[PDB]
């Protein structure tokens, strides 16, 4: 099998706004959250909502997921009308580019092991000067 | 007069968002109904437990072409000066739409395709007057 070079992560308007707000709501510390969405088939990853995660000192790593928090909020979202999956995690890089560094690969490996289609989105809220996201 | 707004859910959810961001406390409620309802005063009484100054913003999902989609109300009970019998009813509070820069960067990008030039082209200005 292989991942086609047509795959697209359709980030919804609400998800984009939440990501940027959470980035500039915690710059120059890093912030992290989950991306509730839906794996449509093999070329689509729909990010319908995003999901802030409390700042936990340990930057953004596997230990920064707080299982009680994520489980309880997923249940609550389910009963308010969001029976959605967890397609990947977003985490801001405050001003130093949009790529990954080591711990990001480890964490994304954890997400892939959970389900081998989870994307990882990186947003640079300082370089996101109005007119370029 | 029979409704079940869930205050336990409200409290737990507010706890989670308080952990996420703390400089934001409950400042009222919203409901996506084009007009008020009889329950609204009771629901405002419920939410006044968590904010004495409650602001009900009736966010109209349906896109109109003339007005803002938000109309905001606040509950007032006071002895009317004209001597007409008093009941607990809503009062208008001016509403506006504004954005932090972190959200302007997003709205601008999302609307760049169907944006209107942020400059007065004579055609655009005549359109504005019409």
């Amino acid at each position: 099998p292989a991942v086609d070079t047509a795959e697209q992560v359709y980030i919804s308007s609400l998800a984009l706004l939440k990501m940027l707000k959470h980035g500039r709501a915690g710059v120059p510390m890093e912030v992290m959250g989950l991306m509730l969405g839906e794996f449509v088939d093999d070329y689509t990853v729909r990010v319908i909502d995003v999901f802030a995660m409390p700042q936990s000192g340990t930057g953004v790593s596997v230990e920064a997921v707080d299982p009680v928090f994520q489980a309880k909020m997923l249940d609550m979202l389910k009963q308010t009308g969001r029976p959605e999956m967890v397609v990947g995690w977003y985490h801001s890089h405050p001003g130093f580019g949009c790529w990954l560094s080591g711990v990001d690969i480890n964490t994304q490996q954890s997400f892939e092991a959970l389900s081998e289609r989870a994307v990882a989105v990186v947003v640079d809220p300082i370089q996101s000067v109005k007119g370029k996201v | 007069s029979v409704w079940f707004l869930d205050h336990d859910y409200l409290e737990n959810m507010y706890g989670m968002f308080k952990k996420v961001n703390a400089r934001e406390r409950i400042v009222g409620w919203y409901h996506t109904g084009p007009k008020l309802h009889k329950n609204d005063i009771a629901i405002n009484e419920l939410m006044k437990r968590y904010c004495p100054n409650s602001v009900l913003v009736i966010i109209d999902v349906k896109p109109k072409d003339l007005g803002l989609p938000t109309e905001a109300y606040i509950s007032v009970e006071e002895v009317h000066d004209d001597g007409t019998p008093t009941s607990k009813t809503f009062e208008h509070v001016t509403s506006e739409i504004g954005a932090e820069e972190a959200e302007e960067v997003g709205v601008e990008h999302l609307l760049r395709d169907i944006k209107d030039t942020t400059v007065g082209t004579l055609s655009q200005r005549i359109t504005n007057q019409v």
Partner: peptide
């Protein structure tokens, strides 16, 4: 006992929650 107990515990809870609040304040330059 209840008056003093709940007074001091309210002090302590308010202090703890305000410590969490402060934990999300970024300094200036």
């Amino acid at each position: 006992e209840l008056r003093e107990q709940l007074k001091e515990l309210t002090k302590q809870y308010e202090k703890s929650e305000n410590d969490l609040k402060a934990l999300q304040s970024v300094g200036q330059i």
